[PDB]
Design a protein around this ligand. Sequence first.
Ligand SMILES: [Mg+2]
Ligand SMILES: [Mg+2]
Ligand SMILES: [Mg+2]
Ligand SMILES: [Mg+2]
Ligand SMILES: [Mg+2]
Ligand SMILES: [Mg+2]
Ligand SMILES: [Mg+2]
Ligand SMILES: [Mg+2]
Ligand SMILES: [Mg+2]
Ligand SMILES: [Zn+2]
Lengths: 53, 55, 124, 96
Amino acid sequence: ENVWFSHPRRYGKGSRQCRVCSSHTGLIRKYGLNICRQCFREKANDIGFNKFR
Amino acid sequence: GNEGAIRDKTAGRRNNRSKDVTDSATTKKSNTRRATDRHSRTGKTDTKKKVNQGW
Amino acid sequence: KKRVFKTHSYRGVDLEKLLEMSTEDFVKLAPARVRRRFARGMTSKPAGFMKKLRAAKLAAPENEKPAPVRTHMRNMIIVPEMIGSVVGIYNGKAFNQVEIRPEMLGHYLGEFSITYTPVRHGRA
Amino acid sequence: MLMPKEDRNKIHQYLFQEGVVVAKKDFNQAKHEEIDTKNLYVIKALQSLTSKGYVKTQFSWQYYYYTLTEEGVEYLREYLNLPEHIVPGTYIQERN
RNA sequence: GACGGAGCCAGCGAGUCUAACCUUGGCCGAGAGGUCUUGGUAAUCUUGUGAAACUCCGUCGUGCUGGGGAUAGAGCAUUGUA
RNA sequence: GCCCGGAUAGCUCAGUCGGUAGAGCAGGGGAUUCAUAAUCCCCGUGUCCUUGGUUCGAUUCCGAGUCCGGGCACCA
Ligand SMILES: [Mg+2]
Ligand SMILES: [Mg+2]
Ligand SMILES: [Mg+2]
Ligand SMILES: [Mg+2]
Ligand SMILES: [Mg+2]
Ligand SMILES: [Mg+2]
Ligand SMILES: [Mg+2]
Ligand SMILES: [Mg+2]
Ligand SMILES: [Mg+2]
Ligand SMILES: [Zn+2]
């Protein structure tokens, strides 16, 4: 109803976040994972990203 | 406004160029505090009973 | 005499025609960036503004500048229809009152309102 | 919160029937999946419902998992009148 | 060695569903780009990613030079509500 | 009340053949420290006293005057 409370949010750092934690910053956007790097390091095992080399 | 800004002498480059440069420009890091890092300021201390209850 | 000086020309058009030409025909003769801005976005833009603007130009006390008309629209391109108006061109705080001249055609409002105070190194 | 009683009924009813709700943490949605109201309405109505018992709330990955409690079953039972032992997710479907 | 013709060879990647991503081909355009179609959710299509240094035949010829391309003026297009 | 000594950055102190102004201290900011010190750097800074004169050029070569600074309680 209130025609006053949004401005574009289609693109840029403001148009997304961490599916895990809201953070707009240091976002992993590759392969559609969309996790912030801090989180991605804590989840990378359960996602299936392991350490080989 | 803009009329002001162009009309204002005491502005632009020549004017700065002709001023001396302060010495705090060519300063140094500062540091302030470091050989106090291990020295606790809290003035509080714990106590063997509280630590022994905890751990 | 006879020759009351002579008018201005935007890019080969003397005032007279420019004034009653149409915004669209004006940008037609404008340069790249302008022609682009106007090309995209045609749905409601410098809207009530002009109305107010013109109303002020009517409410003008004769032979004199119309009252200022404040905006934040630093992005608005200057076109014939707004020639001879007075606009409060915000710079962050402050609306810088500016009258619009024939030779300002096609520039942004924001160019005419400075956004920072110069500098002044050293000094005291 | 502040919301017309009708939407409050959509929420409460849906909730009683389902016994469980989810809502992405995003106010400003306008309509949420399923229930026909503002996401904000769901989230707040629920939150209230919870802080007086009635519902348990879990969060995890931006998402709010809403669980209907027993005392709560009694409560919305009152709010929709519907006679003692009405329903909820409290019967094992066909024989699934 | 710069410029100009011409020769002409990689590997690791990545790409569009409830969407507009990787884009071949045809035309138009000095260029940037435009436009009509198209293949691909992929060892299948873009893509042999014909990459750049490099190779060859020319022009220049030691001169701030045709080395260098900062700064600046005018015009044209692309992303984007801007 | 003398005589003495001054004046330029806030202050303390340099200067000039007369070309274009400095230094310390102060200040402000970094570096070094878990954090402060020390230390080691950075920065910024000027109504050239008033008051006139001299002078191709003067803060800067004079003069006059005013704040003052050092030493001594009205004998032509
Ligand atoms: Mg919003
Ligand atoms: Mg300003
Ligand atoms: Mg070549
Ligand atoms: Mg052409
Ligand atoms: Mg297709
Ligand atoms: Mg290959
Ligand atoms: Mg040379
Ligand atoms: Mg060249
Ligand atoms: Mg530390
Ligand atoms: Zn995160």
